[PDB]
Amino acid sequence: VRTIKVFTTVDNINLHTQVVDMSMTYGQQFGPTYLDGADVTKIKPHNSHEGKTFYVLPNDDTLRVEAFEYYHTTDPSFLGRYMSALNHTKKWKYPQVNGLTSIKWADNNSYLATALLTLQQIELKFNPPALQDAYYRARAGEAANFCALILAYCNKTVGELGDVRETMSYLFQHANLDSCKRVLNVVCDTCGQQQTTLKGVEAVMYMGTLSYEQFKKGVQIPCTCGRQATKYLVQQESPFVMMSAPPAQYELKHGTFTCASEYTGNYQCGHYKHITSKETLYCIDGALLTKSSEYKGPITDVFYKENSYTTTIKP
């Protein structure tokens, strides 16, 4: 009966000694098993595996606690989805473009590239240690684990089409936004005024206009009575805001925004690019970079800096 020693893990930090029988597969001994992303479930131990670390599913109470503390999920398939994505993302390339970690286009990943570029330009801290650790590496240029985690947390597989606004929502759900507050007022000439207070992720996201200045002036929305109501920003406390809308031709003016996402094509199929406002307007499309003094395109999301805002509007 021949054996080697290997280590299992769910978090790649806490290791669990195992003595494995070389006549059985990893799967017969551990359940689904992965070696830096590669599925070894149906493989029998090799001598070269001695001393190496394998990921497994959180198959006992110790691992369940370790996995929840590191990832902040109890979705049973999470670890397998992360590993499956990592086996791909470890082969992607992450060029530094204008000082930021981007992603060379592969596997329909333009939505991930513009999300990653965006994160590097807004003040945001993640809650799960897994995203903390992986995001630090991604800033340094080694973004594979971070991208595989985005995919897993968003329930997206490599190659699946994704929406930037939705992806950001998931990332924000795993971020500490508890200092963010938004007060809105909605005014119907028939139905009167309704103030609402939004906290956390809802305090920093709005769907319906790209213009923060228009959101402060008031945007027209439906009311139940059939009139239009006017929605405006009363008060904002956050380090950024994200304004989104269905893609439409829109002019991005240098110095008036932080960065934006552009979507060319239609709902079936298109492509994202990233625009960042620095000393000029830079358009980052994966590995590609172009510049211009002005920019007009089908924009979907625009990010703005903020600290504290209070309206002058008297009601």
Q: Is 15 in the site for Zn ion (CB under 5 A)?
A: no
Which listed option, Na ion, Cl ion, Zn ion, none, makes contact with residue 84 (CB within 5 to 8 Å by class)?
Na ion
Q: Is 84 in the site for Na ion (CB under 5 A)?
A: yes
Q: Is 194 in the site for Zn ion (CB under 5 A)?
A: no
Q: Which of 42, 46, 125, 296 binds Cl ion (CB under 5 A)?
A: 125
Q: Is 225 in the site for Zn ion (CB under 5 A)?
A: yes
For Na ion, which is the closer residue by CB, 85 or 252?
85
For Cl ion, which is the closer residue by CB, 72 or 278?
72
Q: Is 238 in the site for Na ion (CB under 5 A)?
A: no
> What residues between 167 and 186 interact with Cl ion by CB under 5 A?
174
Q: Which of 22, 191, 207, 288 binds Zn ion (CB under 5 A)?
A: 191
Q: Is 77 in the site for Zn ion (CB under 5 A)?
A: no
Which listed option, Zn ion, Na ion, Cl ion, none, makes contact with residue 191 (CB within 5 to 8 Å by class)?
Zn ion
For Zn ion, which is the closer residue by CB, 171 or 219?
219
Q: Whole-angstrom Cα distance, residue 101 to residue 39?
A: 28
> What residues between 253 and 282 interact with Cl ion by CB under 5 A?
none
Q: Which of 23, 62, 132, 310 binds Cl ion (CB under 5 A)?
A: 132
Query: How near is the Cβ of 255 to Cl ion at its closest, in Å?
Result: 28
For the chain, give the secondary structure using H, E and C.
CCEEEEEEECCCCCCEEEEEECCCCHHHHHCCEEECCEECCCCCCCHHHCCCEEEECCCCHHHHHHHHHHHCCCCCCHHHHHHHHHHHHCCCCCCEECCEECCCCCCCCHHHHHHHHHHCCCCCCECCHHHHHHHHHHHHCCCHHHHHHHHHHCCCCCCCCCCHHHHHHHHHHCECCCCCEEEEEEEECCCEEEEEEEECHHHHEEECCCCHHHHHHCEEEECCCCCEEEEEEEEEECCEEEEEEEEEEEEECCCCCCEEEEEEECCCCEEEEEEEECCCEEEEECCEEEEECCEEEEEEEEEEECCEEECCCCC
Query: How near is the Cβ of 258 to Na ion at its closest, in Å?
Result: 11
Q: Is 72 in the site for Cl ion (CB under 5 A)?
A: yes
> What residues between 121 and 180 interact with Na ion by CB under 5 A?
124
Binding site for Zn ion (CB under 5 A): 188, 190-191, 223, 225, 227
Q: Write out the residues near Na ion by the rule CB under 5 A.
A: 84, 124
